[PDB]
Amino acid sequence: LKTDEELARSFRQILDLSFKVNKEISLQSQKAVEETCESALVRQWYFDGSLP
C-alpha cells in the first residue's frame, strides 16, 4: 500500500526530471544560434522592436 504511493511519487518526479532536462538542452541550443548569427541581427530579432 506504500509501494503504490511510492510508484505514484516516483513517476510524478520522473516527469519533472524530463521537463527540466529539456530546458537545459533548449537553453544550450538557443545560445549556439545567438553566437553563430551576428549579434546585431540577433539584437534586431529580440530588442530593436521594443527600444526606447
Binding site: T3, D4, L7, S10, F11, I14, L17, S18, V21, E24, I25, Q28
Partner: peptide
C-alpha cells in the same frame, strides 16, 4: 506487476539522463 513498474521507472530515468549527457 508492481516489480515491473519499478523496473520501467529506473530504465526510463537512465534513458532521460543518458540523452541529457549525449546532447552535451
Amino acid at each position: 506487476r508492481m516489480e515491473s513498474l519499478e523496473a520501467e521507472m529506473e530504465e526510463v530515468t537512465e534513458q532521460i539522463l543518458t540523452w541529457r549527457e549525449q546532447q552535451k
